[PDB]
Amino acid sequence: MEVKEVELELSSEATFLSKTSIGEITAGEKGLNPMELLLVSIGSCSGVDVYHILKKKRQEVKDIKIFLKGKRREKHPKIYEEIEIKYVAVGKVEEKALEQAVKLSTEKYCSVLAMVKPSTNLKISWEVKWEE
Template structure:
């Protein structure tokens, strides 16, 4: 079993400095929520975590399976409930593959390996939200 750690220090107002083994980032609320808008938003970082986890899988699988792509991007949208304590209920994850010789079948397999087998963040998110997957194949 392994353990991840994080250390978060209050900077005043609604701003915080948060450290984990990969570095340091600033967290802050939007101006509308009483912050200064000077940092990452906690709920939005969940979208980055989902994309980052799957992106690492995709990069490894593209190399391992010798998929011919120029690059790829991942876009994540998350829908929040209207309740007082807003939580995500649906995520839409869109994989965009760019290249002139894309093997759609291979890339679809790569995405499904990430989304259904390897991405731990996606597995965790499925416990509390619906996840919709989309794949686009685009010219370089």
Template sequence: MKIHLKRINKEYRFETTNERGDVVYLDNKSVENPQGASPMDLLLRGLAGCSSIDVVMILKKQKIELDDLEVEVEGFREDGAIPNVFKGIHLHFILQGDAPAAKAIRAVELSMDKYCSVSKMLEKAAEITYSITLNGEKLK
């Protein structure tokens, strides 16, 4: 895995490109009009994406197709700390579809506890918790 970063203005805006040519823009969130994600924002997005891929894959292997999947992620940092790392992260999985509750719970558990590389890496620095809603009913 390889990423290339190039500064594209006189401030803090950067263009990052991976080996496939996918582009993601970074910026400093403290500027007046940021035009990209912050690096810490990308960590939370990566966690949401990694775990979502796992959940979909686990359920597909069981011939279960979701109608929709959303994840809300919130990171908690210690005010004023330098470096200002995440101390806690909470993910809320919102699933829609014909999945049995037990299988939906198990898919999320497997992702968060075993398969999601981003989760496994971040849990060394932050407490990661999660909750699950399936078709409007809170499961966990």
């Protein structure tokens, strides 16, 4: 069982300097918004999967853009009742390859996403932009 550890310390009003393996970022009221950071965690975790899978499937990736939109419940806890994730692959990428990468990521590899899926309505979409 791999262990991951982070440590936070107050840096300003309701804000924390958060220590990770690569460095420290400020998260909170006067720093990175925690709920936006959750979307970044989800997006990057999945993005890593899609990148590697696309590479394994011999696709030529010029760029990968991921757009995440979350809609929060009005009463506490204000969790995301819905999360829309749109993947856009740019380069010599076949739509079938991108679909496979996104599905494998969202249904098997993405650890961050697997932890929140049971508490929200996930809407996934993707598209390719053929470029040289």
